Amino acid sequence: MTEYKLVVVGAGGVGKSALTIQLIQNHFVDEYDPTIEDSYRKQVVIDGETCLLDILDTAGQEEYSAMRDQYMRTGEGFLCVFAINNTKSFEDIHQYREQIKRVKDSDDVPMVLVGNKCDLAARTVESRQAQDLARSYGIPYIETSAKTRQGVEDAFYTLVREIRQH
Amino acid sequence: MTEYKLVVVGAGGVGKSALTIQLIQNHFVDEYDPTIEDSYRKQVVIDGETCLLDILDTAGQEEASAMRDQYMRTGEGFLCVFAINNTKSFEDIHQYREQIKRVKDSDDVPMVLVGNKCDLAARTVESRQAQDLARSYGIPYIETSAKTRQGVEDAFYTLVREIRQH
Amino acid sequence: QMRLPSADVYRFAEPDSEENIIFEEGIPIIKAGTVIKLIERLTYHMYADPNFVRTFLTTYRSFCKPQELLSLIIERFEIPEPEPTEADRIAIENGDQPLSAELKRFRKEYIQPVQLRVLNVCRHWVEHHFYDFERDAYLLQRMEEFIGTVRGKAMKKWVESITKIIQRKKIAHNITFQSSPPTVEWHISRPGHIETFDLLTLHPIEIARQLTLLESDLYRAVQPSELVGSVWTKEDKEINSPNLLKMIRHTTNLTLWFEKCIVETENLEERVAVVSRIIEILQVFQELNNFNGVLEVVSAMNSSPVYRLDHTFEQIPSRQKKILEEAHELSEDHYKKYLAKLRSINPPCVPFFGIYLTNILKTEEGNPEVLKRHGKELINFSKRRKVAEITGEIQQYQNQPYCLRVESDIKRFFENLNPMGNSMEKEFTDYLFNKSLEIEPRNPKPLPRFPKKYSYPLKSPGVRPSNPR
Ligand SMILES: Nc1nc2c(ncn2[C@@H]2O[C@H](COP(=O)(O)OP(=O)(O)NP(=O)(O)O)[C@@H](O)[C@H]2O)c(=O)[nH]1
Ligand SMILES: N[C@@H](Cc1c[nH]c2ccccc12)C(=O)NC1CCN(Cc2c[nH]c3ccccc23)CC1
Ligand SMILES: [Mg+2]
């Protein structure tokens, strides 16, 4: 059974961490606990073949910027998150791509751009700008809600597809 | 990782607090601040086991004599402390052993009589007097100072060895 | 209540219902409950749970303001005494004074515990979470007012030590050891020659020692003030979280000095002496349970500029390829193997802080702040417990201090370390990386030759400590 090792990178303190959590917990349970190991392994059926997702989310450790190389190296696929209400967290995306590209030694790493709506503040990065930016790169773009769990699986499955179809 | 719940009991102002702090932090408290109910954890390795020590430092004054049977209820082993310069505090030990044996409904309760404050020559409770009582209860007698650290580890870990084999 | 006086006046004689407290699974553990019911239990008359106090004062700020806590506990402290009863009322009216058998039952079983357990909350709140008071004088003022105008003879002992703690706190560590600390070890650089100090001329043993002292000192300064409420991720990270930040920046710097020392030693033989001397440090870091330091060194080896240097690591001794790989395996599989080693060494240690950061942050941003039961909104307390669980695990390692003699000069050398100088993170990262491309260029371009830079002997002194007279 294939196991896919996914890494979630992106600028800190913009609801980055809510992407992974909303995926794992069926968003029905109260008691959530990251202490619990294998609360970051998740088995799913994608396009018919069953596979095991293993998601690394280093949220909070963003100041440990030395370790970005160590953490990234561990990934088969990448998921770059920016908040749609934080213009900087988005312009940062350029940088994270080049780090990944370099840590893997590749030009064609499987990855996906994810616009994340975390609260209810004013969107300052348009659907269209993120659309175009991702087009320039050759990667898909998914928009997700941290409130309503909209398009959360939509963005992880897309990354698995980009790993198979690589 | 085995987990042991030690409770320190004793006369008012013998050094239950001063010892417990010296054990956890390697620091000698000088100030007398009457304890109502403090609690501490210490990860330590005793005879090749990692033990998580769970130390409860109780209140000594008679004002809280109402509120004992509650901690005595859940404790695993008991550190009976008196000071070697206060003969009254030694005469009070008899009763502490008693409240414990009653609340525990048992005759076989892991304890260790501790003769604290032995960095002074002002000694009024003689070594024999104290030893003789310890043998009557079938438990070790260890003399300590919080100020000098002498015997502090010895007494606390002897309690843990006792809890283990029982 | 428990017993006796009219429940109307006293807010905390509210009876326990499914609409105001929720339990879980030999005390009881609270899943959720109203703010009142939470304070009632914080100072319950039956048992003192002292862990519950720490969980509360660590985390309470997310569901109740400090001013409103004080008001709330003052309210709890003021307990309606039972009216002179029916055999009291007939003893007062025929001369002498009553015996008061269930006034003193109430006063000894309920009023005595609850008032003392409340003073224990203030004693903690002041002696441990004093920040609430240095960021609000009126709060201190009210609290000081409160304590003065308590007037028992029971509480006389305890009012006294709280008034004196509030004093001690309004201004400003004597450590006693068993055994002596080993002698400070010296290599090429002799004592007081701070200019000749560098990775190769300082004794590897004494580097690892002084950086463990320094990294412990930094770990220990983190209050849980800087942790709760994910404050180290918001825009005021620098105001609310300066000591946590101060040690993440230290770790991040040393990882960069290591990267820089490797890729700037251009000569191959000399670089292999440097990569080896770093793994000889990583090995003394492990003898001292300095995980933070191990994860610097493993994190530096893993970095882009240093990972790719295959000709350099092909020449490391076989014993150290083993040491390096094994320390790398700590981080493997979600720090599985590391959390293992941590919850099993005999401290002092210096944990890797980053894991605790992520767990606090996921737990906050992954659990409900309230619980909607029967259209009422109980405070979700099992969430606040889980956070306090961590901040407690962290406090737990901050207790035992290292037995290593600080060397004034060597310590000032590492504080004043700055590999980046004046350049930014992108600028410096790129530079390091190109020096990697220069000293060991991509295939198929042939490995060039560079000249020696170090004028001193490159042999290591070994990491076995040497004990004279
Ligand atoms: N010289 C000396 N003084 C000690 C020693 N142990 C405690 N003391 C001192 O005796 C006083 C009582 O200390 P303390 O431990 O707080 O007493 P306690 O056991 O907490 N009593 P309480 O029930 O009120 O908390 C303090 O001034 C403390 O410094 C010791 O071994 N030697
Ligand atoms: N030779 C094997 C096995 C190996 C694992 N750890 C090593 C350490 C030194 C030399 C070889 C190895 C190998 O595939 N080596 C390559 C991949 C690992 N490399 C060295 C290295 C740099 N940074 C690291 C961080 C952790 C583990 C190894 C390294 C060296 C090149
Ligand atoms: Mg005490």
CB C329, CB C337: distance < 8 Å: yes
Residues C107 and C45 in one domain: yes
Tell me whether C339 touches chain B (CB under 8 Å): no
- Of all ligands present, the nearest one to the C-alpha of C332 is 2
**Domains in chain B, start-ordered, CATH in brackets?**
1-166 (3.40.50.300)
Q: Which residues is A145 bridged to in the sheet?
A: A117
Assign C118 to helix, strand or coil: helix
- Using a 6 Å cutoff on CB, does residue B13 contact ligand 1? yes
Residue C219 lies in a domain: yes
Please, what is the end-to-end C-alpha distance for chain B in angstroms?
18
**Number of residues written out for chain B:** 166
Q: Vertex B41, ends B39 and B46: CA angle to 5°?
A: 135
What gap in Å lies between CA C278 and CA C294, rounded to an integer? 10
Candidates C283, C306, C303, C296; CA nearest to C248 is C296
Report the DSSP pairing between strands B49-57 and B77-83. Answer: unpaired
Same domain (yes/no): C402, C386: no
Q: What are the chain C neighbours of B39 within 8 Å (beta carbons)?
A: 50-51, 54
SS3 B73: helix
Q: Where are the alpha helices (DSSP H) in C129-203?
A: 131-134, 137-148, 156-169
Q: Which of C325, C326, C436 to mutate to test the pocket of ligand 2 (most atoms within 8 A of CB)?
A: C325
Nearest to A47 by CA among A132, A166, A164: A164
Continuous segment of H or E residues that includes residue C373: strand C370-373
Tell me how the structure was determined.
Answer: X-ray
Paired strand residues for C21: C33
Secondary structure letter of residue C177 according to DSSP: -
CB A156 within 8 A of CB A53: yes
Q: How far apart are CA C401 and CA C464, in angstroms?
A: 23
Do C287 and C429 reside in the same domain of the chain?
A: yes
Tell me the backbone φ, ψ of residue B40, rounded to 5 degrees: -140, 150
Do C307 and C392 have their domain in common? no
Please state whether beta strands C21-22 and C32-33 pair in parallel, antiparallel, or not at all (unpaired). Answer: antiparallel
β-pairing, C32-33 vs C376-380, is antiparallel
Q: What is the DSSP letter of C110?
A: I
CB contact under 8 A, C392 and B41: yes
The whole-angstrom distance between residue C224's C-alpha and the CA centroid of its chain comes to 6
Q: Under DSSP, is residue A84 helix (H, G, I), strand (E, B) or coil?
A: coil
- Compute the distance between CA of residue C135 and CA of residue C129 in angstroms, rounded to an integer: 11
What is the three-class DSSP state of B55? strand
**Cα–Cα distance measured from residue B68 to residue B64, given in angstroms and rounded to the nearest whole number:** 7
CATH of the domain at C319: 1.10.840.10
Q: b/e string for B140-149 if b means 16 or more Cβ within 10 A?
A: bbbbbbbbeb
Taking phi first (over 0 means left), then psi (-120 to 50 degrees means alpha), and beta for anything else, what does residue C431 get?
alpha
Residues of C in contact with A102 (CB under 8 A): 304, 433
Residues 6+ positions from C141 with CB-CB distance below 8 Å: none
**C159 and C197, same structural domain?**
no
Pairing, β C376-380 against β C370-373? antiparallel
- Of the residues C396, C421, C449, the one at which a domain ends: C396
d(C-alpha B96, C-alpha B14), whole Å: 14
User: Rounded to the nearest 5 degrees, what angle is found at the Cα of C259, between the Cα atoms of C255 and C260?
Assistant: 115
Q: What is the largest CA-CA distance in chain C?
A: 114
Residues C284, C150, single domain; the answer is no
C176 inside domain: no
Question: Would the CB atoms of C176 and B26 count as touching at under 8 Å?
Answer: yes
Question: How far apart, in whole angstroms, are the C-alpha atoms of residue C182 and residue C402?
Answer: 11
User: Do C290 and C155 belong together in one domain?
Assistant: no
The residue from C338, C368, C396 where one domain ends is: C396
Counting every residue written for chain A, the total comes to 166
Q: Which residue has the tokens 């441990």?
A: C128
Domain shared by C13 and C114, yes or no:
yes
Q: Is residue C187 part of a domain?
A: yes
In sequence order, what are the beta bridge partners of A42?
A: A53
CA dist C72 and B116 (Å) reads: 40
Strands (DSSP E) contained in chain A are 3-10, 41-46, 49-57, 77-83, 111-117, 141-145
**What is the longest distance spanned by two Cα atoms in chain A?**
43
Preceding omega of C2 cis (within 30 degrees of 0):
yes
- A125, A87 in Cβ contact below 8 A? yes
Residue C147 lies in a domain: yes
Residues B118, B120, B122, B123: what is their CA dihedral angle, to the nearest 10 degrees? 10
Which residues of C29-184 form beta strands (DSSP E)?
Answer: 32-33
Q: Is residue C309 part of a domain?
A: yes
Question: Is C231 part of any domain?
Answer: yes
CATH of the domain at C47: 1.20.870.10
Give the single-character DSSP code of C175: B
Name which of A59, A101, A1, A4 is nearest C359 in CA terms: A59
Its sign, for the CA torsion C388, C393, C398, C400, is: positive
Q: What single-letter DSSP state applies at residue C20?
A: T
Cα separations in angstroms, A82 against A13, A27, C2: 10, 22, 55
DSSP A32: -
Is there a cis peptide before residue C242, judged by omega within 30 degrees of 0? no
Query: Which among C396, C417, C450 is the end of a domain?
Result: C396
**Residue pair B34/C157 in contact by the 8 Å Cβ criterion:** yes
**Spatial distance between the Cα atoms of C307 and A37, rounded to a whole number of angstroms:** 29
Same domain, C220 and C323: yes
Resolution value in angstroms: 3.6
Same domain for C154 and C23:
yes
Tell the residue nearest (CA) to atom 20 of ligand 1.
B17
Q: How far apart, in whole angstroms, are the C-alpha atoms of residue B75 and residue A133?
A: 63
Collapse the DSSP code of B83 into the 3-class scheme (helix H, G, I; strand E, B; otherwise coil) and give the result. strand
Give the residue numbers spanning the domain of C336.
182-353+397-466
- Say whether both C146 and C84 belong to one domain: yes
- Count up the domains in chain C and report the number: 2
The answer to whether residues C140 and C207 belong to one domain is no
The length of chain C, given as a count of residues: 469
Residue C345 forms part of a structural domain:
yes
Q: Residue C204: inside a domain, yes or no?
A: yes
